[PDB]
């Protein structure tokens, strides 16, 4: 196990103070759908007409 | 939860409804005020730091004024149903590896290019019936997914029996084939979970998935064994955890936009909405038009959140008040 | 075919500096968020419009 | 009560508001045990606008 | 749309269109300034050291 | 409200009482857990983020366990009763200016050197009465102490009619001698007013005051006209604001000490104390001693706060629980 650990680099901090880092992500999206309604405010039902 | 604004949105909580400006004692209390001519409308809410008044609504500049109930803002947890397609076979075929694959679409990175795949595997034996496959497949899925090792709650694995057919018995990584003693199991439903929320820091989001399948061999033919089909949901994430960030954002217009940046040196804001209750909403959209040449509108919104437990009593009373004061005809829900 | 776009911004955004509490990001075409040093808000508005 | 007081101290001196100050921590010449302690304070800040 | 670790403090925040200052504050890019040439030492005739 | 600790202090809100680790459904539910052989005691509390237990208490190494009621923590506000000296003169002097002085002791800064004086001046007139003088004096103090432009509230001032003898007549900077329609005013009360409060930033403090008088020539000699006297208080600041800061403090031992340093990059701590309530407190002092050389004590405290319905039901039930599980006797209040 000692060797295994040595396979990893070490980093010198300055104290026992909690630390954090910034993680960058992605941008490209597509928005889910909650529901669809007719022109009179009535919902689709997955079995209704077009 | 940064939202988009039509030039501004304001929010005023309604924990109690009063008749006069002299009854505003406790915070959250609110009253609608309108002259007898019904030419202007404004709200007097009791802020934690004293009485305060909303902007003025030119009642002939009202664009839309509609209410929303709690049940129309609770995200319904979507859930598939996994089974054995009777075409390939209605019973497990001995010796074949049934490797299910749940693909997750919006994992950490807020996108569809941020994919994550969890799996579940089962090797079928001679006497293995469909009930035995479903549970063993469920335990396999629970171990991989119900991990508290996982940084996120991803899915809930449940089972259903032809006896009940509605009662869903749950399958956590703790359960074992001895705890699931029924012989008639029909499917494996998979709900999506609520993720952890933090107002102003962690908005309400979800991870969507689809249970893909891999190929077994049956007669020298590579063939999928399962069919995932969405089912009408049964559980919903209530509103409180969403209104809370709505007003956390819609209060920085009324007040401090630095909602904590130099921590000691700030104006701490007191937020009245409980993020653990449900609220109906009431949006009033209107605009300010100017004089001779300044006709360019300035559209505005006045959001109102009233706790509505059971029947929508509070918001209905509020609506009767605004309609009696402003002569409007907002619909009660 | 013909296409339009537009983006409205208040006037105070002319030379508005950013505190950089969290690193400020510049959506790319690939979909990859990228860390940018620019402290002004129109740097990013321009980028997103184009 | 130190100082030689054997009559007591009247209640007029022991009512809400009586202000007390720290004088010192006296100890024995021989075999004295630990006494005393130290204390601190913090500043504040104010703010303006435009 | 989830936590990478368990000590992930923020989530990705996103909006469309007209950006206000509270939009920029809710994303931690608006902060109060610190005036260092400005300090207030309370006024008093300090009678300690007497 | 930074406080002194005997090497540690920890707080648990006892919103409910469940009698089983299974019934810990919602935050604030607490159960005292002690084996039948009463050697250890701890509390299973439901946190906003799951179950949690407190440090185990050796019933042999417990020093004091006591419950303190809400009224014990309610700061009675000091109120004086200033009248004019019947020795000098039972009535005002024809042409003298009576200048009452209120020296405030702990003004913005902590020290007793941070002094602040506020005055009330009244030039008397021939035929003037005592009641009429108290009227004018109180009104002058109002304009100086109960004004709206003052940075911080300083004192409340009242008036008492001999007919009433207990009712205190408020005198605010809006009041005027037309509103004070009486002739049997006996004195001027000057009461201590509650200062503001902020969780973790502005502890519950007060600024005290003594009324001092200036000297008038009564025959040919400078003399003092008034006698300031302390009468029993009748107002009390409730406990809600102390317990809240206590929790804002004692939860940094069980968790995050960086309450807000690092504004975007922080870990928010949900609290269960509503500063608009009145809690009864219960404190247990105990210690841990080691083996064969580590005999040095580690004194520790575990505090439990429960809301008082007026008769101490929550705490008394909590006391019965701890006493029947630990053999302790904590003197129900």
From Swiss-Prot, chains B, F:
Its main location: virion. Transmembrane segments: none annotated. Residues 75-237 are annotated as: FD. It comes from the Viruses. It is found in: Virion. One of its GO terms (cellular component) is viral capsid, decoration. Keywords: Capsid decoration protein, Capsid protein, Virion. The central region FD is structurally similar to Helicobacter pylori flagellar cap protein FliD. Auxiliary capsid protein that forms an outer layer on the major capsid protein protrusions. Interacts (via FD region) with the major capsid protein. This is Auxiliary capsid protein. It comes from Bacteroides phage crAss001. The lineage of its organism: Viruses, Duplodnaviria, Heunggongvirae, Uroviricota, Caudoviricetes.
Swiss-Prot record, chain E:
It is found in: Virion. Interacts with the auxiliary capsid protein (via FD region). Interacts with the head fiber dimeric protein. Interacts with the head fiber trimeric protein. Interacts with the portal vertex auxiliary protein. Capsid protein self-assembles to form an icosahedral capsid, with a T=9 symmetry, about 77 nm in diameter. Each asymmetric capsid nonamer is covered by 9 capsid auxiliary protein, 1 copy of the trimeric head fiber protein and 2 copies of the dimeric head fiber protein. Displays an HK-97-like fold with an insertion domain that protrudes at the capsid surface. This is Major capsid protein.
């Amino acid at each position: 196990l000692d060797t295994f650990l040595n396979s990893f680099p070490t980093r010198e901090f300055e104290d026992d103070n909690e630390y954090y880092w910034d993680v960058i992500g992605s941008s490209r999206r597509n928005i889910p759908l909650v529901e669809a309604r007719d022109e009179n405010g009535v919902v689709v039902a997955a079995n209704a007409a077009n | 939860m940064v939202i988009s604004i039509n030039q501004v949105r304001q929010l005023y909580v309604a924990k109690a409804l009063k008749a006069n400006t002299a009854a505003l004692t406790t915070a959250g209390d609110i009253v609608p005020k309108a002259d007898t001519a019904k030419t202007t409308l404004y709200f007097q809410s009791m802020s934690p730091a004293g009485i305060v008044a909303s902007d003025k609504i030119n009642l002939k500049h009202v664009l839309y004024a509609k209410a929303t109930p709690s049940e129309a803002l609770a995200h319904k947890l979507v859930r598939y149903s996994v089974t054995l397609d009777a075409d390939v076979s209605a019973t497990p075929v001995a010796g074949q590896n049934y490797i299910l694959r749940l693909a997750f679409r919006q994992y950490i990175g807020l996108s569809e290019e941020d994919q994550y795949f969890k799996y579940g595997e089962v090797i079928a034996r001679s006497g293995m019936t469909a009930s035995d496959f479903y549970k063993k497949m469920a335990i396999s899925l629970a171990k991989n997914l119900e991990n508290k090792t996982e940084s996120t709650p991803l899915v809930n694995i449940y089972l259903i029996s032809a006896a009940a057919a509605s009662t869903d018995v749950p399958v956590t990584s703790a359960t074992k084939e001895s705890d699931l003693t029924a012989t008639d199991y029909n499917q494996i439903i998979i709900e999506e979970t609520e993720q952890p929320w933090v107002l102003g820091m962690m908005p309400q989001a979800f991870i969507p998935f689809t249970p893909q399948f891999l190929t077994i061999t049956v007669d020298g033919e590579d063939r999928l064994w399962g069919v995932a089909t969405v089912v009408t949901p049964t559980k919903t994430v209530p509103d409180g955890h969403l209104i809370a960030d709505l007003e956390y954002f819609c209060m920085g217009a009324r007040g401090d936009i630095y909602r904590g940046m130099g921590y000691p040196n700030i104006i701490k804001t007191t937020y009245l909405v409980d993020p653990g209750a449900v609220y109906d909403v009431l949006d009033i959209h209107y605009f300010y038009t100017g004089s001779n040449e300044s006709v360019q509108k300035s559209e505005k919104t006045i959001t109102l959140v009233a706790v509505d437990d059971g029947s929508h009593t509070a918001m209905n009373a509020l609506i009767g008040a605004i309609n009696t004061a402003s002569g409007l005809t907002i619909a009660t829900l | 075919t013909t296409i339009r776009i537009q983006h409205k911004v208040a006037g105070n955004k002319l030379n508005k500096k950013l505190a950089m509490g969290i690193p400020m990001v510049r959506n790319l075409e690939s979909g990859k968020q990228v860390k940018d040093t620019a402290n002004m808000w129109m740097h990013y508005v321009d980028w997103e419009v184009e | 009560l130190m100082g030689g007081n054997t009559q007591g101290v009247p209640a007029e001196r022991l009512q809400q508001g009586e202000r007390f100050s720290i004088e010192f921590a006296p100890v024995e010449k021989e075999l004295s045990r630990k006494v005393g302690d130290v204390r601190f304070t913090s500043p504040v800040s104010m703010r303006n606008e435009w | 749309a989830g936590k990478l670790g368990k000590f992930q403090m923020l989530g990705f925040q996103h909006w469309k269109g007209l950006t206000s200052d509270n939009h920029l504050g809710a994303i931690f890019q608006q902060a109060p300034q610190k005036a260092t040439n400005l300090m207030v030492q309370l006024l008093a005739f300090y009678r300690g050291k007497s």
